[PDB]
Short mmCIF file of C-alpha atoms and ligand atoms in Angstrom, two decimals:
data_model
loop_
_atom_site.label_atom_id
_atom_site.label_comp_id
_atom_site.label_asym_id
_atom_site.label_seq_id
_atom_site.Cartn_x
_atom_site.Cartn_y
_atom_site.Cartn_z
CA UNK A 1 -19.78 -116.90 -176.42
CA UNK A 2 -18.35 -119.10 -179.31
CA UNK A 3 -15.32 -118.34 -181.64
CA UNK A 4 -14.58 -119.43 -185.37
CA UNK A 5 -11.75 -118.82 -187.68
CA UNK A 6 -12.18 -119.16 -191.53
CA UNK A 7 -9.62 -119.12 -194.22
CA UNK A 8 -10.64 -119.44 -198.34
CA UNK A 9 -8.88 -119.97 -201.41
CA UNK A 10 -8.11 -115.96 -202.04
CA UNK A 11 -6.05 -115.75 -198.31
CA UNK A 12 -9.11 -113.89 -197.02
CA UNK A 13 -9.05 -114.59 -193.11
CA UNK A 14 -12.33 -114.44 -190.97
CA UNK A 15 -12.12 -114.22 -186.99
CA UNK A 16 -15.69 -114.05 -185.41
CA UNK A 17 -16.60 -113.92 -182.07
CA UNK A 18 -20.70 -113.96 -181.03
CA UNK A 19 -22.20 -114.62 -178.18
CA UNK A 20 -25.39 -114.19 -175.41
CA UNK A 21 -23.19 -113.09 -172.39
CA UNK A 22 -24.04 -116.12 -170.08
CA UNK A 23 -24.69 -119.48 -171.35
CA UNK A 24 -28.49 -118.89 -172.64
CA UNK A 25 -28.55 -115.30 -172.17
CA UNK A 26 -30.96 -114.54 -169.61
CA UNK A 27 -32.73 -117.77 -170.33
CA UNK A 28 -35.52 -115.98 -171.38
CA UNK A 29 -36.88 -117.74 -174.47
CA UNK A 30 -39.28 -116.44 -177.53
CA UNK A 31 -39.74 -117.73 -180.99
CA UNK A 32 -37.73 -120.50 -181.14
CA UNK A 33 -34.87 -119.09 -179.51
CA UNK A 34 -32.60 -117.63 -176.23
CA UNK A 35 -32.71 -114.12 -175.45
CA UNK A 36 -29.20 -112.54 -174.63
CA UNK A 37 -28.48 -110.94 -171.22
CA UNK A 38 -26.66 -107.33 -171.54
CA UNK A 39 -23.94 -106.40 -168.76
CA UNK A 40 -23.93 -102.81 -168.10
CA UNK A 41 -20.17 -102.79 -168.55
CA UNK A 42 -30.45 -96.13 -175.25
CA UNK A 43 -28.71 -97.77 -178.26
CA UNK A 44 -25.25 -98.15 -176.32
CA UNK A 45 -23.23 -101.19 -176.78
CA UNK A 46 -21.43 -102.21 -173.59
CA UNK A 47 -17.52 -102.97 -172.95
CA UNK A 48 -16.38 -106.55 -174.04
CA UNK A 49 -13.45 -108.42 -173.61
CA UNK A 50 -13.83 -110.50 -176.88
CA UNK A 51 -10.90 -109.92 -179.07
CA UNK A 52 -11.42 -111.44 -182.50
CA UNK A 53 -7.65 -110.98 -184.26
CA UNK A 54 -5.57 -111.73 -187.08
CA UNK A 55 -1.73 -111.68 -187.35
CA UNK A 56 0.28 -111.63 -190.63
CA UNK A 57 4.24 -111.32 -191.45
CA UNK A 58 5.59 -112.85 -194.92
CA UNK A 59 5.21 -116.41 -195.09
CA UNK A 60 2.47 -116.47 -192.27
CA UNK A 61 -0.90 -115.78 -191.69
CA UNK A 62 -2.66 -116.33 -188.25
CA UNK A 63 -6.82 -116.20 -187.28
CA UNK A 64 -7.50 -116.71 -183.39
CA UNK A 65 -9.93 -115.79 -180.70
CA UNK A 66 -11.76 -117.37 -177.63
CA UNK A 67 -14.82 -117.23 -175.68
CA UNK A 68 -14.31 -116.35 -171.54
CA UNK A 69 -15.72 -113.28 -170.50
CA UNK A 70 -13.26 -110.79 -169.05
CA UNK A 71 -10.50 -113.61 -169.15
CA UNK A 72 -10.11 -113.42 -172.67
CA UNK A 73 -6.77 -111.85 -173.17
CA UNK A 74 -5.35 -113.38 -170.06
CA UNK A 75 -6.54 -116.74 -172.06
CA UNK A 76 -4.69 -115.41 -175.40
CA UNK A 77 -1.28 -113.54 -174.01
CA UNK A 78 0.28 -116.59 -173.08
CA UNK A 79 -0.72 -118.70 -175.68
CA UNK A 80 0.46 -116.18 -178.19
CA UNK A 81 3.53 -115.22 -176.63
CA UNK A 82 4.80 -119.07 -176.63
CA UNK A 83 4.07 -119.41 -179.88
CA UNK A 84 5.90 -116.42 -181.37
CA UNK A 85 8.88 -117.16 -179.23
CA UNK A 86 9.22 -121.18 -180.76
CA UNK A 87 7.82 -123.21 -177.90
CA UNK A 88 5.77 -125.64 -179.96
CA UNK A 89 2.76 -126.17 -182.02
CA UNK A 90 -0.36 -123.68 -181.35
CA UNK A 91 -2.27 -126.92 -180.43
CA UNK A 92 0.03 -127.99 -177.91
CA UNK A 93 0.16 -124.47 -176.53
CA UNK A 94 -3.45 -124.43 -176.35
CA UNK A 95 -3.90 -127.89 -174.75
CA UNK A 96 -1.65 -126.58 -171.38
CA UNK A 97 -3.15 -125.70 -168.52
CA UNK A 98 -3.97 -122.26 -168.00
CA UNK A 99 -4.06 -119.33 -165.14
CA UNK A 100 -5.70 -116.21 -164.61
CA UNK A 101 -6.15 -113.32 -162.33
CA UNK A 102 -8.70 -111.75 -160.74
CA UNK A 103 -7.42 -108.78 -158.17
CA UNK A 104 -5.18 -110.71 -155.65
CA UNK A 105 -6.24 -114.06 -156.68
CA UNK A 106 -4.38 -116.45 -159.43
CA UNK A 107 -7.09 -118.98 -160.62
CA UNK A 108 -5.35 -122.16 -161.84
CA UNK A 109 -6.78 -124.64 -164.22
CA UNK A 110 -4.48 -127.76 -162.32
CA UNK A 111 -3.86 -128.10 -158.53
CA UNK A 112 -0.37 -126.00 -157.97
CA UNK A 113 2.57 -127.18 -155.80
CA UNK A 114 2.27 -126.12 -152.34
CA UNK A 115 6.19 -124.93 -153.79
CA UNK A 116 4.83 -122.54 -156.37
CA UNK A 117 2.02 -121.77 -154.25
CA UNK A 118 4.46 -120.23 -151.42
CA UNK A 119 6.23 -118.41 -153.87
CA UNK A 120 2.99 -116.54 -154.94
CA UNK A 121 1.64 -116.27 -151.38
CA UNK A 122 4.51 -113.84 -150.57
CA UNK A 123 4.38 -111.99 -154.06
CA UNK A 124 1.11 -112.25 -152.43
CA UNK A 125 -0.99 -113.72 -154.67
CA UNK A 126 -3.33 -116.47 -153.17
CA UNK A 127 -4.33 -119.89 -155.52
CA UNK A 128 -7.65 -121.33 -156.26
CA UNK A 129 -8.55 -124.32 -158.73
CA UNK A 130 -11.34 -123.68 -161.24
CA UNK A 131 -13.30 -126.60 -161.73
CA UNK A 132 -14.87 -125.56 -164.93
CA UNK A 133 -12.98 -126.45 -168.19
CA UNK A 134 -15.20 -123.47 -169.73
CA UNK A 135 -13.56 -121.34 -167.36
CA UNK A 136 -10.40 -120.57 -169.25
CA UNK A 137 -11.86 -120.54 -172.67
CA UNK A 138 -11.98 -122.07 -176.22
CA UNK A 139 -9.27 -121.00 -178.36
CA UNK A 140 -9.72 -121.36 -182.15
CA UNK A 141 -7.18 -120.82 -184.36
CA UNK A 142 -6.19 -121.26 -188.01
CA UNK A 143 -2.56 -120.91 -189.53
CA UNK A 144 -1.57 -120.75 -192.94
CA UNK A 145 2.10 -121.16 -194.40
CA UNK A 146 1.99 -118.21 -197.07
CA UNK A 147 5.13 -119.70 -198.62
CA UNK A 148 3.92 -123.22 -199.21
CA UNK A 149 0.57 -122.61 -199.07
CA UNK A 150 -1.12 -125.04 -196.55
CA UNK A 151 -3.40 -124.20 -193.72
CA UNK A 152 -3.30 -125.83 -190.52
CA UNK A 153 -5.29 -125.14 -187.21
CA UNK A 154 -6.07 -125.83 -183.73
CA UNK A 155 -9.17 -126.23 -181.75
CA UNK A 156 -9.61 -126.27 -177.65
CA UNK A 157 -10.63 -129.46 -176.41
CA UNK A 158 -12.46 -127.73 -173.42
CA UNK A 159 -15.24 -126.94 -176.03
CA UNK A 160 -14.76 -129.78 -178.22
CA UNK A 161 -13.09 -127.32 -180.47
CA UNK A 162 -11.78 -128.95 -183.98
CA UNK A 163 -10.39 -127.76 -187.31
CA UNK A 164 -10.20 -128.66 -190.93
CA UNK A 165 -8.78 -128.04 -193.82
CA UNK A 166 -8.35 -129.10 -197.67
CA UNK B 1 -8.58 -125.70 -205.20
CA UNK B 2 -6.62 -123.90 -203.34
CA UNK B 3 -6.48 -123.75 -199.95
CA UNK B 4 -9.26 -123.30 -197.19
CA UNK B 5 -9.94 -124.04 -193.71
CA UNK B 6 -12.22 -123.71 -190.92
CA UNK B 7 -11.62 -123.98 -187.26
CA UNK B 8 -14.91 -124.07 -184.55
CA UNK B 9 -16.32 -125.14 -181.58
CA UNK B 10 -19.06 -127.69 -183.06
CA UNK B 11 -17.97 -130.26 -185.85
CA UNK B 12 -21.31 -129.44 -187.68
CA UNK B 13 -19.72 -126.05 -187.90
CA UNK B 14 -16.98 -127.01 -188.91
CA UNK B 15 -18.49 -129.30 -191.79
CA UNK B 16 -21.21 -126.81 -193.02
CA UNK B 17 -18.53 -124.49 -193.09
CA UNK B 18 -16.03 -126.38 -195.35
CA UNK B 19 -18.60 -127.39 -197.42
CA UNK B 20 -19.67 -124.01 -198.39
CA UNK B 21 -15.59 -123.53 -199.35
CA UNK B 22 -15.22 -126.71 -201.15
CA UNK B 23 -17.79 -125.66 -203.59
CA UNK B 24 -16.13 -122.81 -204.05
CA UNK B 25 -17.77 -120.19 -201.93
CA UNK B 26 -15.68 -117.24 -200.03
CA UNK B 27 -14.63 -116.76 -196.27
CA UNK B 28 -17.58 -114.64 -196.04
CA UNK B 29 -20.24 -116.43 -197.05
CA UNK B 30 -19.01 -119.65 -194.99
CA UNK B 31 -18.75 -117.23 -192.28
CA UNK B 32 -22.45 -116.64 -191.91
CA UNK B 33 -23.24 -120.28 -192.77
CA UNK B 34 -20.76 -120.60 -189.94
CA UNK B 35 -22.67 -118.61 -187.23
CA UNK B 36 -26.42 -119.67 -187.88
CA UNK B 37 -25.28 -123.36 -187.55
CA UNK B 38 -23.81 -122.81 -184.56
CA UNK B 39 -26.87 -120.59 -183.00
CA UNK B 40 -29.02 -123.94 -183.83
CA UNK B 41 -26.36 -126.71 -182.62
CA UNK B 42 -24.22 -124.57 -180.18
CA UNK B 43 -27.45 -122.82 -178.93
CA UNK B 44 -26.14 -122.46 -175.29
CA UNK B 45 -23.56 -120.29 -176.52
CA UNK B 46 -24.11 -117.66 -179.52
CA UNK B 47 -27.51 -117.54 -181.55
CA UNK B 48 -29.88 -114.90 -183.49
CA UNK B 49 -31.09 -114.07 -180.36
CA UNK B 50 -27.52 -112.52 -179.44
CA UNK B 51 -24.70 -110.55 -181.01
CA UNK B 52 -21.11 -110.85 -182.30
CA UNK B 53 -18.19 -109.00 -183.86
CA UNK B 54 -16.32 -109.98 -187.14
CA UNK B 55 -13.08 -109.67 -188.56
CA UNK B 56 -12.42 -109.77 -191.71
CA UNK B 57 -8.69 -109.44 -193.18
CA UNK B 58 -8.62 -110.04 -197.24
CA UNK B 59 -5.28 -109.34 -199.41
CA UNK B 60 -6.97 -105.71 -200.53
CA UNK B 61 -8.90 -104.85 -197.35
CA UNK B 62 -9.42 -105.03 -193.84
CA UNK B 63 -12.95 -104.39 -191.84
CA UNK B 64 -14.48 -104.86 -188.61
CA UNK B 65 -18.74 -105.55 -188.54
CA UNK B 66 -20.04 -104.92 -184.73
CA UNK B 67 -23.42 -106.43 -184.51
CA UNK B 68 -23.35 -106.14 -180.62
CA UNK B 69 -26.58 -105.94 -179.02
CA UNK B 70 -27.74 -102.39 -178.36
CA UNK B 71 -29.54 -101.27 -175.01
CA UNK B 72 -33.39 -100.44 -174.97
CA UNK B 73 -34.79 -97.24 -173.87
CA UNK B 74 -33.67 -108.80 -166.98
CA UNK B 75 -31.30 -106.87 -168.66
CA UNK B 76 -32.00 -107.66 -172.33
CA UNK B 77 -29.98 -106.01 -175.47
CA UNK B 78 -31.79 -105.50 -178.77
CA UNK B 79 -30.31 -108.49 -180.78
CA UNK B 80 -28.07 -107.66 -183.23
CA UNK B 81 -26.91 -111.12 -185.18
CA UNK B 82 -29.47 -111.35 -187.69
CA UNK B 83 -28.80 -107.64 -188.82
CA UNK B 84 -25.29 -108.44 -188.73
CA UNK B 85 -25.26 -111.18 -190.87
CA UNK B 86 -27.11 -109.55 -193.59
CA UNK B 87 -25.35 -106.43 -193.57
CA UNK B 88 -22.23 -108.70 -194.01
CA UNK B 89 -23.78 -110.58 -196.71
CA UNK B 90 -25.26 -107.52 -198.44
CA UNK B 91 -21.23 -105.50 -198.10
CA UNK B 92 -19.11 -108.83 -198.38
CA UNK B 93 -20.78 -111.83 -199.48
CA UNK B 94 -21.32 -113.50 -202.75
CA UNK B 95 -24.13 -116.00 -202.90
CA UNK B 96 -27.74 -115.12 -202.04
CA UNK B 97 -28.98 -115.25 -198.46
CA UNK B 98 -31.17 -117.77 -198.57
CA UNK B 99 -29.01 -120.83 -199.68
CA UNK B 100 -26.43 -119.77 -196.89
CA UNK B 101 -29.67 -120.03 -194.12
CA UNK B 102 -30.57 -123.22 -195.26
CA UNK B 103 -28.01 -125.88 -193.56
CA UNK B 104 -29.13 -124.27 -190.19
CA UNK B 105 -32.84 -124.56 -190.87
CA UNK B 106 -31.76 -128.22 -191.43
CA UNK B 107 -30.75 -128.75 -188.39
CA UNK B 108 -33.20 -127.04 -186.50
CA UNK B 109 -36.05 -128.99 -188.68
CA UNK B 110 -34.13 -132.06 -188.93
CA UNK B 111 -32.59 -132.00 -185.96
CA UNK B 112 -29.06 -132.74 -184.65
CA UNK B 113 -27.35 -135.18 -182.35
CA UNK B 114 -26.64 -133.53 -178.65
CA UNK B 115 -23.21 -133.68 -177.15
CA UNK B 116 -22.14 -133.88 -173.75
CA UNK B 117 -21.25 -130.34 -173.66
CA UNK B 118 -25.05 -129.37 -174.45
CA UNK B 119 -26.28 -132.02 -171.92
CA UNK B 120 -23.83 -130.31 -168.79
CA UNK B 121 -24.73 -126.93 -169.85
CA UNK B 122 -28.49 -127.52 -169.86
CA UNK B 123 -27.94 -129.44 -166.54
CA UNK B 124 -25.98 -126.45 -164.74
CA UNK B 125 -28.39 -123.99 -166.35
CA UNK B 126 -31.65 -125.72 -164.70
CA UNK B 127 -31.86 -123.84 -161.74
CA UNK B 128 -31.52 -120.36 -163.71
CA UNK B 129 -33.80 -121.32 -166.99
CA UNK B 130 -35.91 -124.13 -166.82
CA UNK B 131 -39.59 -122.90 -167.37
CA UNK B 132 -42.56 -124.39 -168.86
CA UNK B 133 -41.59 -123.14 -172.31
CA UNK B 134 -38.43 -125.25 -172.41
CA UNK B 135 -39.89 -129.14 -172.45
CA UNK B 136 -37.96 -129.69 -175.69
CA UNK B 137 -34.32 -129.08 -173.77
CA UNK B 138 -35.55 -130.99 -170.79
CA UNK B 139 -37.47 -133.96 -171.87
CA UNK B 140 -39.55 -135.70 -168.89
CA UNK B 141 -38.16 -132.82 -166.67
CA UNK B 142 -34.05 -133.65 -167.24
CA UNK B 143 -31.48 -132.28 -169.28
CA UNK B 144 -31.53 -134.09 -172.87
CA UNK B 145 -29.07 -136.86 -173.09
CA UNK B 146 -25.96 -136.81 -175.39
CA UNK B 147 -26.66 -138.89 -178.40
CA UNK B 148 -30.27 -137.90 -178.57
CA UNK B 149 -31.77 -135.99 -181.30
CA UNK B 150 -32.78 -132.40 -180.59
CA UNK B 151 -35.17 -131.18 -182.99
CA UNK B 152 -36.43 -127.21 -182.87
CA UNK B 153 -39.48 -126.68 -184.79
CA UNK B 154 -40.15 -123.37 -183.69
CA UNK B 155 -36.76 -122.32 -184.34
CA UNK B 156 -36.90 -123.68 -187.94
CA UNK B 157 -40.04 -121.62 -188.52
CA UNK B 158 -38.09 -118.19 -187.05
CA UNK B 159 -35.13 -119.29 -189.69
CA UNK B 160 -37.53 -120.02 -192.37
CA UNK B 161 -39.17 -116.34 -191.61
CA UNK B 162 -35.92 -114.83 -192.11
CA UNK B 163 -34.72 -116.48 -195.13
CA UNK B 164 -38.33 -115.48 -196.61
CA UNK B 165 -38.16 -111.72 -195.76
CA UNK B 166 -34.76 -110.92 -194.93
CA UNK B 167 -33.96 -109.00 -191.43
CA UNK B 168 -37.50 -107.39 -191.39
CA UNK B 169 -38.60 -111.66 -190.93
CA UNK B 170 -36.84 -110.78 -187.06
CA UNK B 171 -36.99 -107.10 -186.35
CA UNK B 172 -40.53 -106.49 -187.24
CA UNK B 173 -43.60 -108.57 -187.64
CA UNK B 174 -44.35 -111.34 -185.50
CA UNK B 175 -41.36 -112.29 -184.74
CA UNK B 176 -40.47 -108.75 -183.24
CA UNK B 177 -43.84 -108.84 -181.61
CA UNK B 178 -42.75 -112.00 -179.76
CA UNK B 179 -39.14 -110.03 -178.67
CA UNK B 180 -41.25 -107.24 -177.56
CA UNK B 181 -43.58 -109.12 -175.10
CA UNK B 182 -40.86 -111.43 -173.83
CA UNK B 183 -37.53 -108.98 -173.32
CA UNK B 184 -40.09 -105.97 -172.52
CA UNK B 185 -38.48 -103.99 -175.57
CA UNK B 186 -40.37 -101.94 -177.97
CA UNK B 187 -41.06 -102.58 -181.54
CA UNK B 188 -39.45 -99.31 -182.01
CA UNK B 189 -36.01 -99.87 -180.47
CA UNK B 190 -36.53 -103.45 -181.98
CA UNK B 191 -36.98 -101.78 -185.65
CA UNK B 192 -33.95 -99.10 -185.05
CA UNK B 193 -31.01 -101.86 -184.55
CA UNK B 194 -28.43 -100.71 -186.68
CA UNK B 195 -24.95 -102.46 -187.27
CA UNK B 196 -21.59 -100.62 -187.00
CA UNK B 197 -18.99 -100.79 -189.78
CA UNK B 198 -15.53 -100.10 -187.85
CA UNK B 199 -11.61 -99.77 -188.58
CA UNK B 200 -9.75 -102.44 -187.25
CA UNK B 201 -6.88 -101.70 -184.38
CA UNK B 202 -4.17 -102.31 -186.54
CA UNK B 203 -0.33 -102.54 -184.46
CA UNK B 204 2.97 -104.67 -184.36
CA UNK B 205 3.66 -107.62 -182.31
CA UNK B 206 6.98 -110.27 -182.90
CA UNK B 207 7.10 -109.00 -186.39
CA UNK B 208 3.56 -109.58 -187.29
CA UNK B 209 1.18 -106.99 -188.09
CA UNK B 210 -1.99 -107.23 -186.16
CA UNK B 211 -5.27 -106.77 -187.03
CA UNK B 212 -8.26 -106.93 -183.67
CA UNK B 213 -11.51 -105.57 -182.55
CA UNK B 214 -11.88 -102.48 -181.84
CA UNK B 215 -13.72 -100.29 -178.80
CA UNK B 216 -16.35 -101.54 -177.57
CA UNK B 217 -14.19 -104.83 -178.03
CA UNK B 218 -11.08 -105.19 -176.33
CA UNK B 219 -8.38 -105.78 -179.13
CA UNK B 220 -6.55 -102.70 -177.64
CA UNK B 221 -6.27 -104.53 -174.26
CA UNK B 222 -4.84 -107.83 -175.83
CA UNK B 223 -2.70 -105.90 -178.10
CA UNK B 224 -0.90 -104.08 -175.29
CA UNK B 225 -0.57 -106.95 -173.07
CA UNK B 226 1.24 -109.00 -175.95
CA UNK B 227 3.61 -105.86 -176.51
CA UNK B 228 3.89 -105.61 -172.89
CA UNK B 229 4.88 -109.48 -172.77
CA UNK B 230 7.41 -108.98 -175.64
CA UNK B 231 8.88 -106.10 -173.98
CA UNK B 232 9.56 -107.49 -170.74
CA UNK B 233 10.59 -111.13 -172.28
CA UNK B 234 8.59 -112.77 -169.84
CA UNK B 235 9.36 -115.92 -172.54
CA UNK B 236 12.56 -116.24 -170.59
CA UNK B 237 10.70 -117.01 -167.55
CA UNK B 238 8.26 -119.98 -169.33
CA UNK B 239 9.91 -122.30 -167.45
CA UNK B 240 9.64 -120.80 -163.60
CA UNK B 241 6.22 -120.85 -163.30
CA UNK B 242 5.55 -118.85 -160.21
CA UNK B 243 7.81 -115.91 -161.88
CA UNK B 244 6.09 -116.45 -165.55
CA UNK B 245 2.53 -116.39 -163.33
CA UNK B 246 3.48 -113.24 -161.51
CA UNK B 247 4.89 -111.25 -164.25
CA UNK B 248 1.75 -111.95 -166.25
CA UNK B 249 -0.19 -110.93 -163.25
CA UNK B 250 1.85 -107.57 -163.60
CA UNK B 251 1.02 -106.78 -167.06
CA UNK B 252 -2.57 -108.01 -167.21
CA UNK B 253 -3.56 -105.47 -164.19
CA UNK B 254 -1.65 -102.80 -166.29
CA UNK B 255 -3.48 -102.89 -169.14
CA UNK B 256 -7.05 -103.91 -167.41
CA UNK B 257 -6.45 -100.50 -165.75
CA UNK B 258 -5.39 -98.81 -168.72
CA UNK B 259 -8.73 -99.73 -170.21
CA UNK B 260 -10.58 -98.73 -167.02
CA UNK B 261 -9.14 -95.19 -166.97
CA UNK B 262 -10.23 -95.27 -170.63
CA UNK B 263 -13.80 -96.35 -170.15
CA UNK B 264 -14.17 -92.98 -168.33
CA UNK B 265 -8.69 -90.78 -179.09
CA UNK B 266 -7.25 -93.48 -181.62
CA UNK B 267 -6.92 -97.34 -180.71
CA UNK B 268 -3.86 -97.55 -182.75
CA UNK B 269 -2.15 -94.86 -180.93
CA UNK B 270 -3.28 -96.90 -177.68
CA UNK B 271 -1.13 -99.98 -179.06
CA UNK B 272 1.80 -97.90 -180.06
CA UNK B 273 5.25 -98.53 -179.19
CA UNK B 274 5.34 -95.27 -177.38
CA UNK B 275 2.20 -96.08 -175.76
CA UNK B 276 3.33 -99.21 -174.42
CA UNK B 277 6.70 -97.45 -173.37
CA UNK B 278 4.63 -95.21 -171.13
CA UNK B 279 2.33 -97.83 -169.06
CA UNK B 280 2.57 -98.15 -166.01
N1 LIG C 301 -18.54 -114.99 -165.78
C1 LIG C 301 -18.82 -114.00 -167.14
C2 LIG C 301 -18.75 -112.52 -167.20
C3 LIG C 301 -17.24 -112.40 -167.73
C4 LIG C 301 -17.64 -111.02 -167.82
O1 LIG C 301 -17.62 -110.53 -169.18
O2 LIG C 301 -16.52 -109.83 -167.26
C5 LIG C 301 -18.53 -114.99 -168.37
O3 LIG C 301 -17.27 -116.09 -167.97
N2 LIG C 301 -18.63 -114.77 -169.73
C6 LIG C 301 -18.17 -115.76 -170.51
C7 LIG C 301 -19.36 -116.63 -170.73
C8 LIG C 301 -19.49 -117.45 -171.92
C9 LIG C 301 -18.24 -117.83 -172.60
O4 LIG C 301 -18.65 -118.88 -173.24
O5 LIG C 301 -17.39 -117.91 -171.91
C10 LIG C 301 -18.51 -114.58 -172.04
O6 LIG C 301 -17.71 -114.30 -172.89
O7 LIG C 301 -19.47 -114.11 -172.22
#
C-alpha cells in the first residue's frame, strides 16, 4: 500500500491510496508486474481499511492518508487528534512512536516502561513491541494555508516519505 | 505560479509529480503520473497488478473513484489500477494520457536506483515469492542491492502497450492472456472490469469539513474514531500514556465493532453527531 497527496494551483487536493494488498501481492508475476492478493474480507470488492481523507476549514486545507492495513485508522486518529488540539507540527506528530490494538494486545513501536505496562496489564491489555517500522504505517500529508496561500507537508520516515512544494 | 505540492513515499514520485505541476499541470494529471511512477519504482507497494482509490476535492466538486480489484468467478482479484487511471484521466484530467505514462515508462526502460527499503522488502519476501521468473530482482540469487540500477524491460513493454492502446492494452490482448494464465482468471472477467464513481463520505470534526473514502473503504470508521476522540476529549490525557492508550483502545474497538455489525444505508448518517452520540 502507498499513499500520496497532491495540491495544485487551483487548490484542488487529491488524496490517493493504491495497493497490492501484501507486499508484491501474491508474488505471482507476469508481463513485468506483480499480481495483487485479494482479501476475502463475482465482481465484488472486499472491505479495506484504506481511508484517503481531506479536511477543510476557512484558512486551512489538509490532505492525508496512510498504508497499514487494518491499523490505518488507529494510525491516523491520534495523529489528527494531536494536530487539531495544537500539540505541534504535523511532521513532529508523525515522527512520534505509535501504538495499535489487536483484540486484547497493544502493539507498541518502542519498548514501554514497566510503569505504563503494569497500568495496561490491570486494564487488562498486554503489550508487545513490533520490530517492523512499516507495521505502523506511512502517513503522507499536505497542508495548504489558505489565507496566505502556502503549502507545507509531511512525510513518514518509516517509508522514506518526503514532500515538496513550490 | 501559483502554489502546488506533492507528498509521496518515493522521492522519484515526488519529483515527477512536481515536474507536471511546475509545467502547469493539474492535481489529477500529476496524480496519474505519480501513481504510475510508484508502480515502477515502489513496485512492492502498488502497481498495475493492483487497485486503489482516489479522492478528488476541488473548489467546486468532490469525487471518489473506486478502482479496487474485483473478485473473479492464490486469491487474485481483477486489477483495477489501469482502468482507474484511464477513467480518472477521461473524466477529470487535462493532458493526453500518453504523456502522463511516459515518466513511468522511462524508469521501467532506463532504470532507477534501488533503495534500502526495496532491498529489504525483497529480502523478507524471498521465501514467499522467489521463483525462476524473478531474476532481475534477485541478481545472482540475492536481493538487488541498494544503489544498483533496476531495469524492468517486460514492464516497459506492457506500459508502452497501454500507452498505445489505452486500457485495452491491459484488459484484452496478450497482456490479458498473460494475466489469465498466471492468475487463473477468465478473459471475460478481465475485460469486464468496471470502475465505480462514489460520493465521498462527508462529516465534520474539530470545525473541519471532512471528506473521506466510502464503503468498501473505511473512511466512516476513521471519522467515527476522530469524532469519538474529540467528544471524549482524550487529548486531555495525551501526556499520560497508559490513559491515552487505553482510551484509544476503547474508541477503536467501538468503531471497529460498528463496522463489523454493518459489514453484515447512508455513510453520512453513520458519521453524524447523532450517530456518534449513540455509539457504544
Ligand atoms: N497484515 C496485512 C493485512 C492487514 C489487513 O488488511 O487486515 C497488512 O498489514 N496489510 C497492509 C500491507 C501493505 C502496507 O504497505 O501496509 C496493507 O495495507 O495492505
